[PDB]
Amino acid sequence: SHMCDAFVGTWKLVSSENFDDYMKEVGVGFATRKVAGMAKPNMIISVNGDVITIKSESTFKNTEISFILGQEFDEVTADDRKVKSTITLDGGVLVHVQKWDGKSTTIKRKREDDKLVVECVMKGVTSTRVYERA
């Protein structure tokens, strides 16, 4: 057993708060905000050796990242930014930093009770997204 055992599985979005304001702060345009904000993604997390894979499947986009903790990778996000990302484990929380165009956003994922809670921060603006097991 390991690092991210408690994250592994298939998860479904059940609530979102402040996501439009987070996307505004990130610089997402109107049409993408409206459509992306409607999405109810499933998130599929798996581990194979040192490689973690996170898939998001939704009506908007299907995305997948695979990474090793601490090791930077390039990501094209669901809203089409070209970012450089590094994901680490800090006290049991997966911390995902995305950098582009001199900007940065941090996405934290943690297990709380039977949920997976995702907190997305851009400057002073936070969005909280809660997932339950599918």
Ligand X SMILES: CC(C)(C)Sc1nc(=S)nc(-c2ccccc2)[nH]1
From the annotation, which residues make up the binding site?
A: 129-131
* Contact with ligand X (CB under 6 A) among 77, 86, 104, 126: 77
**Shortest CB 51 distance to ligand X, Å:** 18
Q: Which is nearer to ligand X, 8 or 77 (CB)?
A: 77
Beta carbon nearer to ligand X, 49 or 79: 79
Residues in 24-63 at the binding interface with ligand X, rule: CB under 6 A = 26, 28, 32, 36, 63
Rounded-to-integer distance, Cα 69 and Cα 92, Å: 13
Those residues with Cβ within 8 angstroms of residue 41's Cβ, 6 or more apart along the chain or in another chain = 12, 13, 56, 57, 58, 60
Return the SS3 of 41: coil
Tokens of 46: 């798996």
Q: Between residues 53 and 63, which has the closer beta carbon with respect to ligand X?
A: 63
Please report, as residue ranges, which positions from 90 to 109 form the binding site for ligand X (by CB under 6 A): 107
Instruction: State which of residues 78, 89, 95, 121 lies at the interface with ligand X (CB under 6 A).
Output: 78
Per-residue b or e along 72-86, where b marks 16 or more CB atoms closer than 10 Å to that residue's CB? eeebebbeebebebe
CA dihedral of 85, 42, 58, 48, whole degrees rounded to 10:
50
Residues binding ligand X (CB under 6 A): 23, 26, 28, 32, 36, 63, 77-79, 107, 118, 120
